[PDB]
Design a protein around this ligand. Structure first.
Ligand SMILES: [Zn+2]
Length: 99
């Protein structure tokens, strides 16, 4: 299955970016299936704020966040085969921007 623990990121982080801020773990995971991340903050506006290493499942933020602008994000994570076809998923990844 997929484990996607919730992340809290303080607003106003300093460089450098990107910063790893968590990882998704499957563990009993398929060769060489990939972990995919989607949603507002990734491939829907605002685009490119978060990304995932499709192998390690480490999630990274790409810039400093402002809690007053968006105080939280809710993304979807899944595992795919080499062809991006869904195996496991989706499951929420919640990201809270803390004061
Ligand atoms: Zn503050």
């Amino acid at each position: 299955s997929i484990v996607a623990p919730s992340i809290s990121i303080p607003e106003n982080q300093r460089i450098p970016f990107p910063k790893i801020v968590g990882r998704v773990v499957v563990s009993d995971r398929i060769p060489g299936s990939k972990i995919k991340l989607y949603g507002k903050g990734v491939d829907q506006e605002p685009k490119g704020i978060f990304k995932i290493n499709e192998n390690s499942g480490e999630v990274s933020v790409t810039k400093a966040l402002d809690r007053e602008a968006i105080p939280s994000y809710q993304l979807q994570v899944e595992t795919t085969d080499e062809n991006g076809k869904t195996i496991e998923g989706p499951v929420d990844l919640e990201i809270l921007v803390i004061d």
